[PDB]
Symmetry: C2
Subunit: 279 residues, 2 copies
């Protein structure tokens, strides 16, 4: 049977992530307040439709309760002041752990500091730490009780799975320094050709370390030059769903699946794969 | 890639080959049971405009993605399937499948093909360990070369049982003169999805044959699924059941109703495109 052996299931805010195909439910992570999210009126100030945001979060949680696939929120911030208000809102709407997500180190550090101030540290998953992470990111985490982080196995060599393992091994001493004991490895999907390499890296990292592994490909379809021009906008939905679930067919542990609106697509799909492997 | 896979050419459409080399062939059913464009299934009366549109919409997707899009012509009577074949053959030059649960209806499709010269464009769907001798005789007395082989078995979680079913069919193929078999490794329910995929892997290794399946029935029959999640939720579930075997290296999908071409084609195009970058790599074989 499709089992790796000796896999780690980390418990983060009472949610289990990691394990074996079929046996341990895939964790699905939907992003909210992402770039150009239409529920956001002003991304700098972080002004948004709270009714619509709450509904999006609760709709993912309803699907999660039905399938048994844990559903978490990935909170994106484009400014320090925005992400503070987003964190306060999400923490008011749900008890689940959630990710704080920014490409900008200063915004993630501001999220860490806000978690310390209002009392969210052990509910926060830092998204992400990479080989390129700044020392001040590692210091901010070290001076916190945040235990969990996404490790981005970033590499220019997008078709190499070994380059992603190398990237992970560059981050591993940063995790020790920061006190991160529950890493979730984002095996890094940049484009369509990265899809098989990221999946292979997940299998090799699960074999070597047993960490929970996953990725997200909304990205890879959004970056696919000529795709939408040819096939149309609606065609991105099945393409994104496929790119998001290929790694689950190939044994990974979680999906950063992109816009939280897509929960109604990704939960039934992944529920099907998990069920197939379980039985 | 190893170099042992058979890529069959049927009606100038290529099906199969080394994993990642060539586009997945996508096969959508038309005039299936309770298809709403059919007014009378016994007489084969149907909305010709809507049927033509369904076929042409799949072919536009095929022309854009490079995935060959074929029609699976379902018949519920002998007279209906003759008229369906004549319509489909008039609307496209592509090969197409003739499909019925009833042996006599598939035999009538064979006889019609012989009558109007369609034998090189027809794929008989399907031959199984349970096929009647009259089916094998009809094929033997024809120039039809291609058939879907259904690796049918009561043991739905067993991949060895599907290989056994294929090997029961091999001498029927020789007697019928089927030189281009396409192996439907038989998805029954959701738990059979990995067994069918593993069977396809073993068959590709042992024989060179193109392999595939479809899963449309696996979701329809999931007790409690539609009750828990919506009716809409069947579509992403069906997409997965249709694509898991492509992720695991198969060659074609019998994806169900031709209406779903706009769901299956973008998804499979994405897998094929990703795997093309890894064609003939040790990496893809490991993955």
């Amino acid at each position: 049977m499709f089992r790796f052996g000796n896999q780690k299931a980390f418990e983060i805010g009472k949610v289990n992530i990691g394990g074996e195909p079929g046996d341990n439910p895939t964790v699905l992570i939907g992003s909210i307040f992402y770039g150009k999210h239409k529920i956001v009126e002003d991304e700098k100030k972080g002004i948004f439709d709270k009714e619509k945001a709450e509904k999006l979060i609760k709709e993912q949680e309803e699907l999660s309760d039905k399938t048994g696939n844990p559903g978490l929120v990935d909170v994106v911030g484009m400014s320090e002041e925005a992400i503070r208000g987003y964190m306060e809102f999400v923490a008011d709407v749900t008890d689940k752990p959630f990710l704080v997500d920014s490409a900008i180190a200063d915004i993630k550090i501001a999220a860490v500091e806000y978690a310390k101030e209002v009392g969210l540290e052990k509910r926060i998953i830092y998204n992400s730490i990479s080989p390129e992470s700044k020392d001040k990111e590692i210091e901010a985490l070290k001076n916190s009780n945040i235990e969990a982080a996404v490790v981005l196995a970033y590499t220019f060599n997008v078709t190499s799975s070994k380059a992603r393992i190398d990237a992970l091994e560059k981050v591993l001493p940063k995790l020790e320094e920061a006190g991160i004991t529950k890493p979730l490895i984002d095996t890094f999907v940049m484009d369509v050709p990265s899809l098989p390499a990221a999946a292979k890296a997940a299998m090799e990292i699960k074999k070597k370390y047993g960490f929970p592994c996953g990725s997200g490909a909304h990205n890879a379809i959004a970056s696919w030059k000529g795709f939408k021009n040819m096939l149309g906008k609606e065609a991105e939905k099945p393409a994104v769903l496929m790119a998001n679930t290929l790694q689950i067919v190939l044994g990974s542990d979680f999906v950063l699946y992109g816009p939280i609106e897509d929960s109604k697509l990704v939960f039934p799909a992944v529920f099907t794969i998990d069920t197939a492997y379980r039985y």
